[PDB]
Design a protein around this ligand. Structure first.
Ligand SMILES: Nc1nc2c(ncn2[C@@H]2O[C@H](COP(=O)(O)CP(=O)(O)OP(=O)(O)O)[C@@H](O)[C@H]2O)c(=O)[nH]1
Ligand SMILES: Nc1nc2c(ncn2[C@@H]2O[C@H](COP(=O)(O)CP(=O)(O)OP(=O)(O)O)[C@@H](O)[C@H]2O)c(=O)[nH]1
Ligand SMILES: O=C1CCc2cc(-c3ccc(C(F)(F)F)cc3)ccc2N1
Ligand SMILES: [Mg+2]
Ligand SMILES: [Mg+2]
Lengths: 438, 429, 334
């Protein structure tokens, strides 16, 4: 049916997306060659199929994805990989010159050359393809490439497409530690401007997620890939719902519109539950209540937050595996009765949530065991804003240092823009607070 | 690609740079034919980009041979892997600096231009762009300095675009063969520092002491230490050039390293740092490398890490690291000292993991930071020069050198200005 | 000591380019107030305002001559005393660096200088120089006789640590006004820097014009010196879309402007180290920085809302400038 294409920015963007795609191939059972020895994709090109790839050739499935990188390094890996055989060279592009970590310079210097090719490349696919319900963006806040690239991308994409939805899965520097000095500069500067253009932005708790996942793992270490693995699987679940109707399938975006009362709130924070480590998956069979409850607990929360602190204007539920609404209701009563999750006065209603027939999607070689149901929720809290602030302060300090200016100025970027980022952040925090208050 | 030209010059560097290139060549594992012995494609490509392929798929090393005296190169050529370099590639002035930064400087330049131009043209042709150039020489010794001074300006001058790092041994403050010897260096370096974006220097004495002590050998060998140094350099090249799970571009890192391009340079650090017996026998635990690096001993130059302050420290791990190893290492640093960590900037340290663990030990790290004490110490040396100035010995020779006194004074002067910032570095955490 | 460094702000009449821009004048100049107010918006819409009070404030309306009179005439007397004085123009080109230099300012000045001196009746000589600082390199405009770059090196003359000596440049003295003009015309051509896409003309290079006057009267001998500095400004490369070289050069200066802002914040700091030597300009400037030299700054700003950064940047600057304590001393010599 509908096809979606994913964009990867930075080394991180590609890698993460890479996880996504292969998962898709596996889930379809389409061979990494791109033409599955398995029969053609489900329902022929299913909506899932088409988004993942298209059957052309015919009898070949080629994924709908564009991989972009300033630095040749990561993309070259792709070329190496078997998946590469699947991906026709058109899809995969590499860039000679890396970010190396300047949002502005990478953005300006790299972006100009790259954009034309990419836009064309995407364009052709876009033209050929029926279209995307939306497309996913991958990139790294920390990575210069993601920063610079995204900024360039956002405006252009926004301007051109307009209607087409945009979603960005971004990596938010863990408050625990940046990667670079640069990263705070990059992140804040890049993020604020782009975000406004973007419908919503997503950030990751590297620390929180890594800690949580790792702890869930009860593993000395998660693999970066493994970490990605979690990301992919959840996404796949997301795709699955829209792609294939579950017990309840909803327009994800349309629901999302419901979900976010405001464009002002680009995105509600989203969670996936139950929080499943491999071990966690092992430990229990999730129940509707269990998953929800688990989800509520911050341990579930990939982001480190006090869900208590934030209000819940509303939350969404995704369902995977078999589900019966009765159970849902039971969960509902449990949740509703439970004080702990606070509901904003504004939205009296939890609704709505959706259920998927198919059991939750998993990333291939998934570390975690399968869970009967998978769920995702959106909540809007002040606290989430706070996290941004948390990063912001360090950046602010940097600004105070006024160190890491002439690199930016070489890029001709101002302080004022940065200040604007800060002020916008403050804006935004205020807005978040305002909305956050019930 | 983005090959960088390797330069050996100064007698020191006549060894030392040569050692670096050769060892790097060893790192190449390309057979002496210049074909690639090494099966590994990955190394092969990376090396291959580095080394232009002669027919027979020979690898043309990116290097120039500079002779204080022509014999020196001869020894080099007679030395191993003479074959790998095509004799055409290098040429050296017979004269050399002569021990004199200025004297060498003036004399050398005429020769320098001819040699530089040909190679540079080739090199420029060779890769679409070079990341930069590396220089090996001993500033402390007269020629490294003498050649460097002349060479650096033009060479840097040629491409403002290119970013170059220079290597020179700094004279050991502990002792000098002659007072004059560091003198030649000082003017060279002083001029050099502004000229060159990046300088990497290790005090000879400390390296010798550390090397020797660690070695528990009677003495550190010149070559061996050079080898060690070259090893230090090699990892950086190898890791950056090579894929890495996390790889940082030079331009990032470099820009990153200075809390902004005003800070001229950062002083090198090597990891793992261990004693000869210790390191050889011992294997690094994940935390292990960090700890060694952390301690004063780690720094090639002798500095008290407290005395110095780190604008930033960067280490490149080579090979994979566990993320919790990442966590542990990072955590320790902040914990260890408030002052050690820069207050201003959290995550002071950056690290990248080399995609492939180095030949030999799986994990390797580099140290980044500055030693406050060391820089200050050096300035003191200039003061020693000043005292010498009271002597005003060999003013005439300097006159022959043609350098003005004022350059001397200013050269110290600028340094003096800078040095007091150096303390400031320590002052800031 | 010294009088505090004098800072005046001038808001340009909306540039025609501004008009093409359809730039809107956020900027309000209340010359009575000597207040200039900028619609920041803050986060909010530029209902929000940021208001500064200035030593002297000129709205767009302010006539050029007037400005000069108010700023130059008092300086000229200091020159005759033996003062060393410096006036630097910062701001936007639209704001009228170019508006100011196209007309005087320079041609007017040499005429008046002779008139005041000769009426003074002091036996005097007048020597002029004109150099441009381009990409951190010095180039002699003034003497086409001299090279495109004057042989430029600078050392400390021990009398003033900040005090410096620029070897090789020559100012040629002429008692008459006229000779000066002839030079003046010549100098200008050399001076001219690159034009920009955005602006018909731009100053690629900072221009430094210096007039030295030797005076003798019955015996007291005084030397007066005036430096007229015209800022070189950069535009965002990205905005410009300028050729990479052009962008690079702009970036260098632009970045240099940050460096300039860095030193300035140090001056405010009264921090132990002032990064004069990090720029040839600030090294040359160096003794002037709150120094013995009597210094005035003319910051030009565009009412246009469009350039937030420059408006903000100027505002920040104006605060910083005051902080440094200017010790103009009349350098009267007998
Ligand atoms: N979601 C993930 N984030 C990662 C992963 N590995 C690193 N990172 C994060 O990504 C950030 C670094 O960004 P990138 O590697 O994408 C760099 P980028 O190509 O955008 O620019 P440069 O490398 O500076 O040229 C930093 O915050 C890391 O913590 C990973 O496997 N997944
Ligand atoms: N660590 C090392 N230091 C060395 C070595 N050889 C010399 N040196 C030091 O370098 C300095 C001498 O410089 P050079 O060896 O480069 C002599 P150069 O050709 O530069 O000039 P001339 O004096 O004209 O011969 C001096 O401080 C020595 O102690 C070496 O192999 N290793
Ligand atoms: O194109 C232009 C106009 C001039 C300008 C001034 C500044 C500045 C001026 C003054 C300060 C300080 F001194 F107040 F710090 C800081 C920045 C920064 C950028 C620019 N760019
Ligand atoms: Mg990257
Ligand atoms: Mg020698």
């Amino acid at each position: 049916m509908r096809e979606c294409i994913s964009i990867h920015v930075g080394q991180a963007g590609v890698q993460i997306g890479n996880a996504c795609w292969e998962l898709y191939c596996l889930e379809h059972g389409i061979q990494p060659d791109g033409q599955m020895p398995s029969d053609k994709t489900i329902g022929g090109g299913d909506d899932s199929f088409n988004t993942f790839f298209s059957e052309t050739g015919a009898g070949k499935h080629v994924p709908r994805a564009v991989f972009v990188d300033l630095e040749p390094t990561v993309i070259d890996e792709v070329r190496t990989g078997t998946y590469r055989q699947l991906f026709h060279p058109e899809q995969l592009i590499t860039g000679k010159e890396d970010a190396a970590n300047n949002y502005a310079r990478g953005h300006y210097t790299i972006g100009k050359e790259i954009i034309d090719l990419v836009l064309d490349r995407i364009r052709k696919l876009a033209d050929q393809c029926t279209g995307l319900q939306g497309f996913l963006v991958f990139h790294s806040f920390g990575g210069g490439t993601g920063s610079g690239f995204t900024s360039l991308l956002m405006e252009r994409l926004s301007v051109d497409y307009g209607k087409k939805s945009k979603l960005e899965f971004s990596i938010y520097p863990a408050p625990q530690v940046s990667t670079a000095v640069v990263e705070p500069y990059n992140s804040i500067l890049t993020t604020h401007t782009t975000l406004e253009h973007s419908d919503c932005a997503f950030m990751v708790d590297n620390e929180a997620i890594y800690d949580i996942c790792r702890r869930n793992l009860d593993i000395e270490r998660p693999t970066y890939t493994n970490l990605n693995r979690l990301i992919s699987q959840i996404v796949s679940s997301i795709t699955a719902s829209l792609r294939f109707d579950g017990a309840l399938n909803v327009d994800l975006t349309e629901f999302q519109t419901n979900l976010v009362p405001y464009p002002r709130i680009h995105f509600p924070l989203a969670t996936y539950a139950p929080v499943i480590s491999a071990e966690k998956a092992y430990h229990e069979q999730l129940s509707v209540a269990e998953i929800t409850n688990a989800c509520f607990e911050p341990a579930n929360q990939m982001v480190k937050c006090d869900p208590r602190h934030g209000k819940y204007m509303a939350c969404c539920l995704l369902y995977r595996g078999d589900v019966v609404p009765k159970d849902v209701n039971a969960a509902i009563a449990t949740i509703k009765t439970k004080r702990s999750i606070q509901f904003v006065d504004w939205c009296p209603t939890g609704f709505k949530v959706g259920i998927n027939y198919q059991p939750p999607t998993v990333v291939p070689g998934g570390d975690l065991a399968k869970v009967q149901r998978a769920v995702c929720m959106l909540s809007n809290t002040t606290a989430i804003a706070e996290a941004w602030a948390r990063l912001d302060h360090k950046f602010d300090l940097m600004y105070a240092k006024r160190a890491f200016v002439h690199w930016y100025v070489g890029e001709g970027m101002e302080e004022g823009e940065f200040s604007e980022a800060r002020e916008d952040m403050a804006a935004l925090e205020k807005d978040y607070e305002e909305v956050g208050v019930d | 690609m983005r090959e960088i030209v390797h330069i050996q010059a100064g007698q020191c560097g006549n060894q030392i740079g040569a050692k670096f290139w050769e060892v790097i060549s060893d790192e190449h594992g390309i057979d002496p034919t210049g074909s690639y012995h090494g099966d590994s494609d990955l190394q092969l490509e990376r090396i291959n980009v580095y080394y232009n392929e002669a027919a027979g798929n020979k690898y043309v090393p990116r290097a120039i041979l500079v002779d204080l005296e022509p014999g020196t190169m001869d020894s080099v050529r007679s030395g191993p892997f003479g074959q790998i370099f095509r004799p055409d590639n290098f040429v050296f002035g017979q004269s050399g600096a002569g021990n004199n930064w200025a004297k060498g400087h003036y004399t050398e330049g005429a020769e320098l231009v001819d040699s530089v131009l040909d190679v540079v043209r080739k090199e420029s042709e060779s890769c679409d762009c070079l990341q930069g150039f590396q220089l090996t020489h001993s500033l402390g010794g007269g020629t490294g300095s003498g050649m460097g001074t002349l060479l650096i300006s033009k060479i840097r001058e040629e491409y403002p675009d290119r970013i170059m790092n220079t290597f020179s041994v700094v004279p050991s403050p502990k002792v000098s063969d002659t007072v004059v010897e560091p003198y030649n260096a000082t003017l060279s370096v002083h001029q050099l520092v502004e000229n060159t974006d990046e300088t990497y220097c290790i005090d000879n004495e400390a390296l010798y002491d550390i090397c020797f002590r660690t070695l528990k050998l009677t003495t550190p060998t010149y070559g061996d230490l050079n080898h060690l140094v070259s090893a230090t350099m090699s990892g950086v090249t190898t890791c950056l050039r090579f894929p890495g799970q996390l790889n940082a571009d030079l331009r990032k890192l470099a820009v990153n390293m200075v809390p902004f391009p005003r800070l001229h340079f950062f002083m090198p650090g090597f990891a793992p740092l261990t004693s000869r017996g210790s390191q050889q026998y011992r294997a690094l635990t994940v935390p292990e490398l960090t700890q060694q690096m952390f301690d004063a001993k780690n720094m090639m130059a002798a500095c008290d890490p407290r005395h110095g302050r780190y604008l930033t420290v960067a280490a490149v791990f080579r090979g994979r690291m566990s993320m919790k190893e990442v966590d542990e290492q990072m955590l320790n640093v902040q914990n260890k000292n408030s002052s050690y960590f820069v207050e201003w900037i959290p995550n002071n340290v950056k690290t990248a993991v080399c995609d492939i663990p180095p030949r030999g030990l799986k994990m390797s790290a580099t140290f980044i930071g500055n030693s406050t004490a060391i820089q200050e110490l050096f300035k003191r040396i200039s003061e020693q020069f000043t005292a010498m100035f009271r002597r005003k010995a060999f003013l005439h020779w300097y006159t022959g050198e043609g350098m003005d006194e004022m350059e001397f004074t200013e050269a110290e002067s600028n340094m003096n200005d800078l040095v007091s910032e150096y303390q400031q570095y320590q002052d800031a955490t | 000591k010294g009088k505090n460094i004098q800072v005046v702000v001038r808001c340009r009449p909306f540039n025609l380019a501004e008009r093409k821009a359809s730039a809107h004048s956020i900027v309000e100049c209340d010359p009575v107030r000597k207040e200039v107010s900028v619609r920041t918006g803050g986060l909010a819409d530029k209902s929000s305002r940021k208001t500064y009070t200035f030593d002297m404030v000129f709205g767009a309306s302010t006539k050029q001559i007037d400005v000069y009179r108010s700023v130059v005439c008092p300086i000229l007397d200091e020159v005759i005393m033996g003062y060393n004085c410096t006036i630097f123009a910062y701001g936007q080109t639209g704001t009228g660096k170019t508006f100011t230099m196209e007309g005087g300012i320079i041609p007017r000045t040499l005429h008046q200088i002779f008139e005041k001196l000769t009426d003074n009746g002091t036996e005097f000589s007048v020597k002029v120089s004109l150099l441009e600082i381009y990409n951190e390199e010095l180039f002699d405009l003034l003497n086409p006789s001299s090279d495109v770059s004057e042989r430029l090196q600078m050392f400390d003359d021990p009398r003033n640590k900040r005090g410096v000596i620029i070897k090789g440049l020559e100012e040629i003295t002429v008692h008459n006004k006229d000779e000066v003009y002839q030079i003046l015309e010549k100098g200008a051509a050399k001076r001219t820097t690159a034009a920009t896409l955005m602006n018909a003309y731009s100053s690629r290079s900072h221009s430094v014009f210096s007039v030295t006057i030797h005076m003798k009267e019955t015996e007291l001998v005084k030397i007066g010196k005036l430096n007229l500095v015209d800022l070189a400004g950069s535009e965002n490369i990205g905005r410009s879309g300028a050729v990479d070289k052009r962008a690079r050069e702009a970036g260098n200066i632009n970045q240099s402007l940050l460096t300039l802002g860095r030193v300035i914040t140090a001056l405010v700091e009264r921090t132990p180290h002032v990064p004069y030597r990090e720029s040839k300009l600030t090294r040359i400037l160096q003794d002037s920085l709150g120094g013995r030299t009597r210094t005035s700054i003319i910051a030009t700003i565009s009412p246009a809302s469009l350039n937030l950064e420059e408006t903000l940047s100027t505002l920040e600057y104006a605060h910083r400038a005051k902080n440094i304590l200017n010790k103009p001393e009349v350098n009267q010599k007998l």
